[PDB]
Structures are given as C-alpha cells and as structure tokens.
Amino acid sequence: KLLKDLLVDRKEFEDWKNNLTWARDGTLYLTTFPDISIGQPKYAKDINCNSKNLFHVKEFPLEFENKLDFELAQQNGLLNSQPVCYPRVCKPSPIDDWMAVLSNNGNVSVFKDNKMLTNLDSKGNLSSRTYHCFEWNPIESSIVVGNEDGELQFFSIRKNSENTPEFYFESSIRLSDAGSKDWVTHIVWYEDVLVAALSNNSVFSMTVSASSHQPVSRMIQNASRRKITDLKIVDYKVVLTCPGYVHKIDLKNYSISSLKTGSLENFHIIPLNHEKESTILLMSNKTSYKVLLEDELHVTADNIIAPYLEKKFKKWSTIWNEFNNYETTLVIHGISLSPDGYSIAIVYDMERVAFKYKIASEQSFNIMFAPLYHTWTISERAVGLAWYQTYQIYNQSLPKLPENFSMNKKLLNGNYPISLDFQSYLNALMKSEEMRIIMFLNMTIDKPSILSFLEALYEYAINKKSELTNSFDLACVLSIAAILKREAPIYNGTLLMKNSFLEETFNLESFTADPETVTSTTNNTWKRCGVTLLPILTTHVKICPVSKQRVIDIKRDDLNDYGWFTRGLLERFNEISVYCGTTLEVM
C-alpha cells in the first residue's frame, strides 16, 4: 500500500508556508531555517518500502549575496532589517538542472548545485529592484520576478562568456498604476499563459509568447481586502484560495465561479493534472477534498490522501491514548507534487496541547509519499531517479508504455536522422520516446542494455566511414560493431592510451574480444568506458548510480587525443547516464 514515511530530524521552518518542492531529477527541497535541506535522490535495487532508501536528507548550505547590501532601506523599510541572508522560497527549474531561491532580502539568485550563477538585477529604483516572488518559464529557459512596483521583470539566458549560463534583464511589465506601491505577490506560469497577483489582491493575466509581442495584460479580478492564500492554474483556469473561499476563473471564456470552504483557515490547492476532468484537491491541516472545475464547482470527498493521512493520525492516538486528555492537530509544513505529477509529498508534523518550545535543533518532521492515481507514465517532466521514485511509489507497477513498444526496438522507430551534425544527432536520440522508456526500464531490470541506442550510434558512424580516421574513434566503433554482432570496418593499428602517469597500448583487434573488458599489449586487463567502450586507465571517471557503469571524464582528460566521434560522445554524456539518464557522480 504505502511507502514508509521519511524522517527529517532536527530541522525547523520559519513559517507554515509551503517549503517543499520536488525537482525534475527527483530531488526534494525544503526551505528550512537557516539552511535549505535537500533530499538527495538515491537508487537502491530494493527498499523494504522505506522511502528512507529513496532520498537521503542533507543540509544544503548556500552563499547568498545581497545586491541591496549597501543600500539604505526605503519605502519597504523592513528591507535590510535582517542583514544575514537566508532562504525564503525555493523553486527548481522545471526544465534545466538549476534552481532559484528568493532570499529574505528580496534577492532572487540562481544556482547550479551550490555555486551561484547570477543574482538577478536590473534598472534602478530599489523599489524596482527588490522581489517577492519568481516563476520559471515552463516552456523555454527563462525566469520572472515580481517586485515592489507591481511589475514583472523577465530574464533570459545564454549570453555565455564561454558556455557558462548567466542571466540578464530582458523585459518588464507594469501591473499597478504609477502612483501606487502594492507588490506582486504571486506568479504562476503555465504553458503559453501567465497569471500574477498583487498586494491588493487584484489579479492579472497575459499571454507571454511570441516575445516580439509586447505582451498585453488583462485584469481578471478587482482589488480586494481578501488576502490571496494560494494561486494556481489548471488547464487555462485560474484557481485562488482565500480565507474561507476558493475562486475559479476561466481564461478560456472569462467567467468566475466560487465556493465557500467552512474551514476559514487558509489552505492549498493541488491540481490533479492527469484527470481529463479539470480536477483539484483542496487540502488543509484540518480536512481536504476534490473539486471539479466545471462552471459549477463540485465537492466530492475521496481525497485519496486523507484516507491515508487520518489513518496515520489515528494511530498517533497512542501518544495521547484515545480521548481528549490532550489537544491534537496535524500540521502541514509543505506539499508538492512529483515533477511528473503522479505522486504527492507532504511534509507534516503531529502535536498536542500547549507546547514547551524545545530549542532549534531538536524537533522532527515526516514526509509522506503517496500515489495520486492507479496508473502512471514516463513523463518528459521528470528524469532519472524521479521516474524511479514514481515506480516505487506506485508499488512497483510498470508504467503504461505504448503498444508494440519493446525494449529491443529501434530508436526513432529505426528512422535515424543521420544527416544531422553529430551533436544534433545525439540530442535527436536523447529526446526520442524509446530512449526514455528504455532508460527507465533499465532501472527495473537486472542488466541495463543500451543496444537500441548503440545501433543508432553505429548507423551514424558507418555512414561517415571515410571520416573515422582517429584511433579512439576506431577502437570505439569496432567495439560497438562487436556488441551489435554487426559487420565492422576493417583496420590494422594498435591504440595507445594514457593517464597522468602511465601508458598502455591496445591492439585494435582486442576491442572485439570481449564486451566488458579490453586487454592490453602488456597483458593488463581493464574495464570499459560504457559510453565509449574505450579502456579505463584512470581514477577519473563518473559513475551511473543505477547501472554502476563507469564513464570516462573528458573534462579531466588533457592527455588522450579523442576524435570527433569519441569526444562528441564523452562531452555529450559527461553528466547524464545513457543507461538510465540519472546524473553521473564523481566517484
């Protein structure tokens, strides 16, 4: 039935505000105080149903810089009131491996792992330059901030100075009138349409799209004293919560419909995206339910979570052993969907009467992981272990998979775009639907295979036979030809490979002798590269955490003269596993 809950020990949160996110690649992020806490995605062939073996939780210390550092607080005033910088909200990119953090001082900074990339900044004012929310572009690689002017500033990327990402200001939109300083307090960005909200709870929407179009924005709700609790967007339908209300707004046709909640204690919306049925899950500390988003809102109960939750919460009635001899409530510190949206993670806590504070470090939580449906799929919205997690959370059910797909059936249905330049050709394959399914399934089976991929590789090389004049490239395609039990080009050299301190030469023959190892001229046998099938002479490898296949780290290889084919591979798969598409770990 359900995965065993994950202990998060001796952390604390600044507020009851939703501090949980679940990143594409399967990582959990909690915005705890004073550091972010991370649930590192881990692979174990078996977990006795303990989500402990899916995420190992760790402190994720970061180095926030204050762009406003030397700036005297102004219209806000509460600005640099707290000098030391710590994280408030955190949202990983839905697209790239990458993540932004709003700090307590209105800075939005972008991070690759821990190294900061660029701290978003622009124009002037200060009012203009201090932020209260940010959203990632769900379609391409950009980001939006909201500032204290009631304005949205947009940032695009490349710029580069050699392959280092780097953001820059791109455009803005004013939302409130000039003679006013309500701030932007919410931005949800979905597909082709963007919706934001202001301090005065007025709400706006636009189409940011063909960018040359200076995007026309339209107010979809008057200013109101009713503070917007949570704002999201379900297939071109905007959903707000309130104190005691839920409002829905059809962008599709421009019409509002809203329902009371009784609870009057603010609470969050979880969209149930795989419904073909415009459905959501309102959920609070106290209770929770389904709401269909037809013209009429409809409450059906199920909740598919509350069954599980109140089961756990009733069991805890021994630590208060039945009766009101104390006073208990379930506390939610965060909720987040799977990147693929098939599971749910809930950070929660359960306590009692009048409390006895209990210092900082001392205090634990639980993360519950639960499936939202009866079946799932390998979504493009998750990668690597994130898929594996869904697999596990769905009790080891294989995902759907197209009819007549089989694991040894050709990439792109055999129809290989060999006319492309090598690097486009590899992207082409990586994006392919088959590669994805194969990658995930490799996490399921005893012996990860990449044959369907290797064949595509081979058909590419062969096409350019007169251009395989590099011996590493040679040794490489020779090796591939062998695995594929397929006609190789002939050849007659040896190969010489190095590491910092030593060399081993190899006869081009001996690349066909064995799929796993190659043996040298001096009779020392080494393991193979696994992207390249080349010899491994060096500590400096990366390792795929599922297959344990070891890949040559080209970024640490000054010594060896890799040819177009062989290098183009090692560059391209320097960080991602071809076997399961999880990210490779420096060993």
Partner 1 sequence: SARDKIERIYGLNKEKLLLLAKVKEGFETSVFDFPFKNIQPDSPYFVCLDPPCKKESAYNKVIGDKNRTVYHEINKTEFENMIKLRTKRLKLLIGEVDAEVSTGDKIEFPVLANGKRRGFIYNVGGTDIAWLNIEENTDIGKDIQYLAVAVSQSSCIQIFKMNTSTLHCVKVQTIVHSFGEVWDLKWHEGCHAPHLVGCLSFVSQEGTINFLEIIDNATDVHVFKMCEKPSLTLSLADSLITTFDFLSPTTVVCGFKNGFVAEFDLTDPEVPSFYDQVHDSYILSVSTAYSDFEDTVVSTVAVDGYFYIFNPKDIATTKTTVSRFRGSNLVPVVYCPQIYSYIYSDGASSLRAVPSRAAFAVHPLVSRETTITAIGVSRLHPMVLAGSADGSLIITNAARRLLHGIQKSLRLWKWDYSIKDDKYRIDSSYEVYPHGINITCTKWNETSAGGKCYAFSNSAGLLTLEYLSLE
Task: Single out the segment in contact with partner 1 by CB under 8 A; choices: 58-66, 352-360, 373-381, 561-569.
Answer: 352-360
| Burial status of residue 207 (CB atoms within 10 A of its CB: 0-12, 13-18, 19 or more) | middle
Give CA–CA dist 90/56, Å, rounded: 19
Applying CB under 8 A, the site for partner 1 has a residue count of 37
Taking the least distance from each CB to partner 1, the nearer of 75 and 423 is 75
Counting contacts by CB under 8 A, is residue 78 touching partner 1?
Answer: yes
- Please select the residue that binds partner 1; options are 45, 61, 70, 77, rule is CB under 8 A: 77
- Please select the residue that binds partner 1; options are 25, 182, 434, 473, rule is CB under 8 A: 182
Rounded to 5 degrees, φ, ψ at 430 are -65, -35
- Please select the residue that binds partner 1; options are 61, 83, 179, 402, rule is CB under 8 A: 83
Q: How many CB atoms lie within 10 A of CB 274?
A: 16
Counting contacts by CB under 8 A, is residue 279 touching partner 1?
Answer: no
Taking the least distance from each CB to partner 1, the nearer of 130 and 479 is 130
Taking the least distance from each CB to partner 1, the nearer of 183 and 387 is 183
Taking the least distance from each CB to partner 1, the nearer of 241 and 520 is 241
Output the smallest distance, CB 221 to partner 1, in A: 15
Output the smallest distance, CB 185 to partner 1, in A: 5
Whether residue 108 contacts residue 131, with contact meaning beta carbons closer than 8 Å, is answered with yes
- Please select the residue that binds partner 1; options are 10, 17, 159, 409, rule is CB under 8 A: 17
Give CA–CA dist 331/267, Å, rounded: 12
Output the CA–CA distances (angstroms, integers) from residue 586 to 293, 528, 580, in the order listed: 47, 17, 17
Task: Single out the segment in contact with partner 1 by CB under 8 A; choices: 24-32, 311-319, 354-362, 531-539.
Answer: 354-362
Q: Dmax of the chain from CA atoms? A: 86
- Please select the residue that binds partner 1; options are 138, 165, 215, 243, rule is CB under 8 A: 243
Closest listed residue to residue 62, CA positions, set 121, 117, 116, 136: 116
Counting contacts by CB under 8 A, is residue 244 touching partner 1?
Answer: yes
With a CB cutoff of 8 Å and minimum separation 6, the contacts of 431 are: none
Taking the least distance from each CB to partner 1, the nearer of 227 and 252 is 227
Q: Enter the tokens of residue 517.
A: 């190892």
Counting contacts by CB under 8 A, is residue 264 touching partner 1?
Answer: yes
Taking the least distance from each CB to partner 1, the nearer of 227 and 465 is 227
Taking the least distance from each CB to partner 1, the nearer of 183 and 425 is 183
DSSP 139-177: SSS-EEEEETTSEEEEEE----TTT----EEEEEEE-S-
Output the CA–CA distances (angstroms, integers) from residue 139 to 212, 386, 486, in the order listed: 17, 20, 41
- Please select the residue that binds partner 1; options are 50, 82, 209, 424, rule is CB under 8 A: 82
Counting contacts by CB under 8 A, is residue 91 touching partner 1?
Answer: no
- Please select the residue that binds partner 1; options are 140, 191, 265, 362, rule is CB under 8 A: 265
- Please select the residue that binds partner 1; options are 142, 199, 279, 442, rule is CB under 8 A: 199
Counting contacts by CB under 8 A, is residue 74 touching partner 1?
Answer: yes
Axis-axis angle for helices 385-393, 433-441 (nearest 10): 60
Output the smallest distance, CB 274 to partner 1, in A: 30
Q: Before 34, cis peptide (omega within 30)?
A: yes
- Please select the residue that binds partner 1; options are 88, 248, 542, 567, rule is CB under 8 A: 88
| Burial status of residue 401 (CB atoms within 10 A of its CB: 0-12, 13-18, 19 or more) | middle
Task: Single out the segment in contact with partner 1 by CB under 8 A; choices: 268-276, 290-298, 350-358, 490-498.
Answer: 350-358
Output the smallest distance, CB 251 to partner 1, in A: 24
Taking the least distance from each CB to partner 1, the nearer of 178 and 216 is 178
- Please select the residue that binds partner 1; options are 60, 98, 154, 183, rule is CB under 8 A: 183
- Please select the residue that binds partner 1; options are 354, 445, 502, 586, rule is CB under 8 A: 354
- Please select the residue that binds partner 1; options are 225, 276, 374, 447, rule is CB under 8 A: 225
Give the pairing type, strands 184-190 and 193-198.
antiparallel
The type of residue at 8 is V
Hey, which bits of 45-105 come out as E strands? Answer: 55-60, 87-92, 99-103
Q: Enter the tokens of residue 213.
A: 């179009």
Residues in the chain: 587
Give CA–CA dist 342/394, Å, rounded: 9
Counting contacts by CB under 8 A, is residue 106 touching partner 1?
Answer: yes
Output the smallest distance, CB 176 to partner 1, in A: 12
Give CA–CA dist 265/303, Å, rounded: 18
Task: Single out the segment in contact with partner 1 by CB under 8 A; choices: 74-82, 246-254, 471-479, 537-545.
Answer: 74-82
Output the smallest distance, CB 17 to partner 1, in A: 5
Taking the least distance from each CB to partner 1, the nearer of 197 and 570 is 197
- Please select the residue that binds partner 1; options are 76, 328, 397, 494, rule is CB under 8 A: 76
The alpha-carbon radius of gyration of the chain (Å, integer) is 27
Output the smallest distance, CB 232 to partner 1, in A: 16
Whether residue 518 contacts residue 505, with contact meaning beta carbons closer than 8 Å, is answered with no
Give 201-224 as a 3 state SS string: CCEEEECCCCCCCCCCEEEEECCC
Q: Interface mask (CB under 8 A) for partner 1, residues 121-140, using x and -? A: -----------xx-------
Taking the least distance from each CB to partner 1, the nearer of 75 and 524 is 75
Give the pairing type, strands 55-60 and 87-92.
unpaired
Tell me if residue 258 falls in helix, strand or coil.
Answer: strand
Give the binding site for partner 1 (CB under 8 A).
14-17, 72-79, 81-83, 88, 102, 104, 106, 132-133, 181-183, 185, 199, 225-227, 243-244, 264-266, 354-355, 357
